[PDB]
Write a protein that binds this ligand. Structure first.
Ligand SMILES: NC(=O)C1=CN([C@@H]2O[C@H](COP(=O)(O)OP(=O)(O)OC[C@H]3O[C@@H](n4cnc5c(N)ncnc54)[C@H](OP(=O)(O)O)[C@@H]3O)[C@@H](O)[C@H]2O)C=CC1
Ligand SMILES: Cc1c(Sc2ccc(OC(F)(F)F)cc2)sc2nc(N)nc(N)c12
Length: 186
């Protein structure tokens, strides 16, 4: 298994969701970026694995589930088996990351991408080790009911460039946004 990564889009007031959906109207190129970053593996013969919580799963339109070309793992303590369309179920983040090392996944999985929601991000971000954050800054405030945890910039360095990630301001539907990559190693 390769690197551990989180990826999120977040408004200025740290919002990531409202009522089971995004706070903003659909940004088609931002979704394209998310699909590209999470799907693209540099290691031939492997796929990347996406880890998400149960509400994040159910927030993705059914026609887009599972996230194609990725192994899809859902976190839940209430479910007894993966949801329809998902590949794996784990009861904790640590359990998921362990599974990754089992013979049934150890030689299949390149990058691990945590794709939401708030509690899965917070635990990943606060656990020692090497981790990157791929953050899209949506440059407006939007009403939200779910929030991205605080990024401690003492530990997470904003990288001044990253291959494959545009550095200038994007705009769709009149909404400006920018892409960022952070790295820690502790
Ligand atoms: N803008 C963005 O980039 C993103 C936006 N979103 C939006 O954010 C919202 C969904 O997020 P949120 O409420 O945070 O929900 P989650 O996706 O984190 O789902 C929470 C449920 O997941 C299970 N769960 C979460 N963490 C763990 C864990 N570590 N171990 C085991 N089970 C766990 C629990 O289910 P159980 O009770 O069954 O144990 C919990 O009730 C939606 O509005 C979605 O649209 C989501 C991802 C990214
Ligand atoms: C989870 C998420 C979303 S919700 C979503 C909804 C539909 C999807 O399928 C399709 F095909 F791209 F419409 C894929 C993801 S946008 C987003 N942006 C970034 N930067 N980080 C994240 N973690 C997310």
């Amino acid at each position: 298994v390769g690197s551990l990564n989180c990826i999120v889009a977040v408004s200025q007031n740290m919002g990531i969701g409202k009522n089971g959906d995004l706070p903003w109207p659909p940004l088609r190129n931002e979704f394209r970026y998310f699909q590209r970053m999470t799907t693209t593996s540099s290691v031939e013969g492997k796929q990347n694995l996406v880890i998400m919580g149960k509400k994040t799963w159910f927030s993705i339109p059914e026609k887009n589930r599972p996230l194609k070309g990725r192994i899809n793992l859902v976190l839940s303590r209430e479910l007894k088996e993966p949801p329809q369309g998902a590949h794996f179920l784990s009861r904790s983040l640590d359990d998921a990351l362990k599974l990754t090392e089992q013979p049934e996944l150890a030689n299949k999985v390149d990058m691990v991408w945590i794709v939401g929601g708030s509690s899965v991000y917070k635990e990943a971000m606060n656990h020692p080790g090497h981790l990157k954050l791929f953050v899209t800054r949506i440059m407006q405030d939007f009403e939200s009911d779910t929030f991205f945890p605080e990024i401690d910039l003492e530990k997470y360095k904003l990288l001044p460039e990253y291959p494959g990630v545009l550095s200038d301001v994007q705009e769709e539907k009149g909404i400006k946004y920018k892409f960022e990559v952070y790295e820690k190693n502790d």
